[PDB]
Design a protein around this nucleic acid. Structure first.
Lengths: 96, 93, 80, 108, 93, 78, 96
DNA sequence: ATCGATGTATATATCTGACACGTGCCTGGAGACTAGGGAGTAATCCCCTTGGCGGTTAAAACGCGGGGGACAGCGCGTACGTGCGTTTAAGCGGTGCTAGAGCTGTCTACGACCAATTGAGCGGCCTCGGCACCGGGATTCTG
DNA sequence: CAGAATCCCGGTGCCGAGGCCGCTCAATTGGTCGTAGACAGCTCTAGCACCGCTTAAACGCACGTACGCGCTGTCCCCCGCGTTTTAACCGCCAAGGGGATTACTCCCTAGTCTCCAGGCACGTGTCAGATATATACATCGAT
């Protein structure tokens, strides 16, 4: 049967998701996580339907930016696969 | 209650630049936020510049200096000309 | 709780794909989850602080906008 | 006309409550300023000053010195995890850096 | 003409924490600018909180919220404790 | 052309304070360019504040404000 | 004869200069450079004696921080010698 | 199988000049009285908030055949370090000049505060045409 | 280079943007007069320039050993594809806590006027500090 070689699909996905615009994290799991973390500070809090979307958009933008930076650090070592030390370096240089 | 916005003015400008094109509600919300953002940055810097000289009134000179400090070179180069022309015409009226 | 497991592996893969990463090692997921938790905690603490000052019980979108604004990132499209 | 006594004495503070109150009104932060804002702010500033001076004074004895200089302040700030977070971006003249060498650079 | 600095108050506090040590003019200059920095941050944040709620005055509630926002977790607990002690003593004096 | 006044020994000393053990021979021209670019952005701002006040003498306060606007608050010069 | 092995003097220099606090750039050449750059914006400018010192302290603090960062991104590549691409990478991740 | 030479450290001797107490004095701060509107409080309307059940495939999960990206190793050549030598202009001490920053005094143009009016804008409703979802096809590009 | 994945066009079809009337309350014209912003006239400090002797630092050159780099082996682990499982997901239905408002009403503040004592300069003196001396011994190296 026809089979694509490793990475061809990855590039096709990169093009697809770079050209698209919808959100990628599931709404319900994130909503439950937001309500869970808030529980340590104050109980019985209430959240608007748009606040959860705002938090999801902020998190997706932050993570995408961190992955973009991590890729440069990965290429610099002549590797292609990103690894945890690369993330730690990016965060250290950014001063996080 | 009544809520103010800059939406009608953004629409008038759009109609002057491209009469046939239209704008969605999301774009109107973005433009309505962007205008307040830049407004606060310029008014803030003009306020700081006023105190260092012990002046009690803000004038066009403070705005021109703040604009030159905040905006990059070419944008400042054009915007200063626009403001100068506008102020000249307004004062001549 | 187990809700941290709700950020499944495929969501991380799609996010990494958007950034152009072609190959990802299997250990990146736990680091990403840890990195996300501290950011959410930091933003929510400020949001809840603003909510508590107003004596409200519901957390509104404006409080999140101001939290992000203080951390140095500005969000356009929800108000302000 | 009773004999006047300073507000700093009543609160039990060293910083000048009157001067802080004047600086708030002249700063245009708001059209009205309540009575409790300056006493609270003065107390906070006194606390932070005392903590900095205490750490610098302890660092001075470790060098058998008797007079505080900028190097001791730099060593005090960069060595405390709380002060370092508040002052991560501030640059102090004549402070120098803390001694640190990566283990990879030391001799085999 | 007459200048203004906090070197006197820093000296009074220094003689309370360590009555046998002195401080050089170079360290005094840094301590004098540090106070002006923290003063400006707290007054700034307090003014923003007061404006968002549409209030005309700044009160201890604004100072407390700003302090909880600007200062790290451990400094805030102690600072707030002694601030409330000071306010309580003043109001009860 | 006074950029040559930042001599090689000074660059080595700065790299030493930073913990640099070995320095490649090409670092000098890049460092010269970086320093020139950093200086230009501060000087333009200092001059801007000087001109707004109609003064002809550049003052320490002008540099203090210029650095603060970029987020590099400098303590020590009043 | 007697001769030290390469790098031991460097380590002694590191321990020396990390302990001291004096300025490392020559005052007069730097003053001339400041004088030369300001001339492109306005003529007949004057500088207070303390202004050049403030600029020198800021420049040295900036170079020191940039070199500290460049060393980390240099070791990360399994090298010890800093090179131009390390400065360019540090500046890129720093967003400058 | 081990010993010592350079450099940092340290200790004793010496004078310099910055830190600290003083007096005189001037204008910021605290004492006393007042008027008003920002704020605190209760009652109400009603929306949009939390909670539940139906049911269908989108999305996730677990296996797995396997090849390509990763590191650990060897061989090596020329780029950078430590040191010696020559000389450069960096360093410093002093005399002079005056550009130009900071203070005193007079003065009148500009702005904030009031009375009165009215149409630019905000709100709810109508409506019709641009995007959306579908389906069928040629084409691109790849293993 | 066979063929799987892609773009594109014609059709059916639906609710968002665009237009409208009601009507109010934010903005405007005209008016006043208090103090801030404008200038010249003047004081005296310090930035700029040159003189000169000395030398701390710099430019330059030799050479040798240590690092950066290219090819290699080979393997073990992320990828691409298949079948089974699940809860998200739209949608319809309840009902009431909280949010937004009017209305009352009171006490906390900004303002004027007084006056004194806190702290801002000019005067100084002595003892905390740095410079100049010799020597101990650790490390890194050679033997």
């Amino acid at each position: 049967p026809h089979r694509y070689r490793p990475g061809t699909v990855a590039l096709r996905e990169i093009r697809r998701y770079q050209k698209s615009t919808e959100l990628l994290i599931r709404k319900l799991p994130f909503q439950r996580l937001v309500r869970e973390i808030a529980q340590d500070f104050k109980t019985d809090l209430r959240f608007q339907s748009s606040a959860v979307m705002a938090l999801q958009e902020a998190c997706e933008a932050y993570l995408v930016g961190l992955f973009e930076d991590t890729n440069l650090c990965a290429i610099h070592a002549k590797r292609v696969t990103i690894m945890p030390k690369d993330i730690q370096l990016a965060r250290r240089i950014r001063g996080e | 209650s009544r809520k103010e916005s800059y939406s009608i003015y953004v629409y008038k400008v759009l109609k002057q630049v491209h009469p046939d094109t239209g704008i969605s509600s999301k774009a109107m919300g973005i433009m309505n936020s962007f205008v307040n953002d830049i407004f606060e940055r310029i008014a803030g810097e003009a306020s700081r510049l006023a105190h260092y000289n012990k002046r009690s009134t803000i004038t066009s000179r403070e705005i021109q200096t703040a604009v030159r400090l905040l905006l990059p070179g070419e944008l400042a180069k054009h915007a200063v000309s626009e403001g100068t022309k506008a102020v000249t015409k307004y004062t001549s009226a | 709780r187990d809700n941290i497991q709700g950020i499944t592996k495929p969501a991380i893969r799609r996010l990494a794909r958007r950034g152009g990463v072609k190959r990802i090692s299997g250990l990146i997921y736990e680091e990403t989850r840890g990195v996300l938790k501290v950011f959410l905690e930091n933003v929510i603490r400020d949001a809840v602080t603003y909510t508590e000052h107003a004596k409200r019980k519901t957390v509104t979108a404006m409080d999140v906008v101001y939290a992000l604004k203080r951390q140095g990132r500005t969000l356009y499209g929800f108000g302000g | 006309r009773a004999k006047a006594k300073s507000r700093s004495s009543r609160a039990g503070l060293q910083f000048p409550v009157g001067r802080v109150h004047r600086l708030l009104r002249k700063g245009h932060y708001a059209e009205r300023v309540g009575a409790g804002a300056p006493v609270y702010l003065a107390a906070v500033l006194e606390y932070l000053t005392a903590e900095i001076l205490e750490l610098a004074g302890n660092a001075a004895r470790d060098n058998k010195k008797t007079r505080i200089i900028p190097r001791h302040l730099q060593l005090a700030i960069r060595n405390d995890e709380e002060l370092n977070k508040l002052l991560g971006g501030v640059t102090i003249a004549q402070g120098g850096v803390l001694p640190n060498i990566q283990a990879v650079l030391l001799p085999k």
